[PDB]
Design an enzyme around this catalytic site. Structure first.
Site, PDB file in Angstrom:
ATOM      1  N   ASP A  35       0.864  -1.269   0.026  1.00 39.42           N
ATOM      2  CA  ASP A  35       0.333   0.180  -0.201  1.00 39.42           C
ATOM      3  C   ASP A  35       0.828   0.980  -0.116  1.00 39.42           C
ATOM      4  OD1 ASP A  35      -2.123   1.885   0.293  1.00 39.42           O
ATOM      5  OD2 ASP A  35      -2.473   1.109   2.648  1.00 39.42           O
ATOM      6  N   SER A 199      -0.565  15.466 -12.390  1.00 45.28           N
ATOM      7  CA  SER A 199      -0.695  15.111 -13.817  1.00 45.28           C
ATOM      8  C   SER A 199      -1.217  16.579 -14.559  1.00 45.28           C
ATOM      9  CB  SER A 199      -1.970  14.148 -13.748  1.00 45.28           C
ATOM     10  OG  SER A 199      -2.265  13.743 -14.707  1.00 45.28           O
TER      11      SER A 199
END
Length: 330
Positions: A35, A199
């Protein structure tokens, strides 16, 4: 040193991935959910409330000759889906794919929430975010990666998750045979303890690319792709019959649909998530309403590039002094 381990979807929907991890002496092998959005290595154990164990493999510290109680230490964690676990702490030897760390904090669960109990395939979590998020008190502990870092050939790990197929986690090296083209690296902020990056934009299907900054985290421990409501609306508007359902808890679409792809930007590069990756199947057995793999992050407070996004790429988690993230197509 290096390590290399295969990671395997837990079910036919890729709801999560498990990777075998050796703990203790002799080894006890547990299948952990790696994770990159949290920083605790915790396991089902011989200490876990018996009614809360249902098929998991447990760690038994008393059977490990290298286990030592970390006296006074406790831990308690809550995750974004409302699940939780807590307990005490041992140090022990932990190996992943041939890479061994001695003195790793292994957090032994005394309590786990229902969603953990109900998932017999996940024996615990292995956190790979920054150690500043680790919940052990009163002495915060380091992640497996942080402990391993100095011994690695290169201070990196890579996630290569499969679509309906096994993939790989590598530690300490970049497998140049595992991706196509070049790796595009992008800046990371560690201010919130995550692999947080921005992004450069998105496209829906064959549509034009929209240049826009989207701050989010690369999180292998989250199944879906969670993005701003504007972006998600633009995606689902291209699917006939798709709608957001408050009763179901997100966007659903007709199971008869062909989903369009979704592209996200990494610098000047582009990663394409095929439409099929965005299908999470019937909302309930036999239903013709299917659950979408791209969902709104509104009310989470952060955008999350979960498995739906990451499995479309070869992803480099660069833990150099100034960390960065790299993405390549594959």
């Amino acid at each position: 040193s290096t390590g290399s381990a295969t990671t395997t979807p837990i079910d036919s929907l890729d709801d999560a991935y498990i990777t075998p991890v050796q703990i203790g002496t002799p080894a006890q092998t547990l299948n952990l959910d790696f994770d990159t959005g949290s920083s605790d290595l915790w396991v089902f154990s011989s200490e876990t409330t018996a009614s809360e164990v249902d098929g998991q493999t447990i760690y038994t510290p008393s059977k490990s000759t290298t286990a030592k109680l970390l006296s006074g230490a406790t831990w308690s964690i809550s995750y974004g889906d409302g699940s939780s676990s807590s307990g005490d702490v041992y140090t022990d030897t932990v190996s992943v794919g041939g890479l061994t760390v001695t003195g790793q904090a292994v957090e032994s669960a005394k309590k786990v929430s229902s969603s953990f109990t109900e998932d017999s395939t996940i024996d615990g979590l292995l956190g790979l975010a920054f150690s500043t998020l680790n919940t052990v008190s009163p002495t915060q502990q380091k992640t497996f990666f942080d402990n391993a870092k100095a011994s690695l050939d290169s201070p990196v790990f890579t996630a290569d998750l499969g679509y309906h197929a096994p993939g790989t986690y590598n530690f300490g090296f970049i497998d140049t045979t595992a991706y196509t083209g070049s790796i595009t690296y992008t800046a990371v902020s560690t201010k919130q303890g995550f692999w947080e990056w921005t992004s450069t934009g998105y496209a829906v299907g064959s549509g034009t690319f929209k240049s826009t900054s989207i701050d989010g985290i690369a999180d292998t421990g989250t199944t879906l792709l969670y993005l701003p409501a504007t972006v998600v609306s633009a995606y689902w508007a291209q699917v006939s019959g798709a709608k957001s359902s408050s009763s179901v808890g997100g966007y659903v679409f007709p199971c008869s649909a062909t989903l369009p792809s979704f592209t996200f930007g990494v610098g000047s590069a582009r990663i394409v998530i095929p439409g099929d990756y965005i299908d999470f199947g019937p909302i309930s057995t036999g239903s013709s309403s299917c659950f979408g793999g791209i969902q709104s992050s509104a009310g989470i407070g952060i955008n999350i590039f979960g498995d739906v996004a990451l499995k479309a790429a070869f992803v480099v988690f660069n833990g150099a002094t100034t960390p960065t993230l790299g993405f390549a197509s594959k």
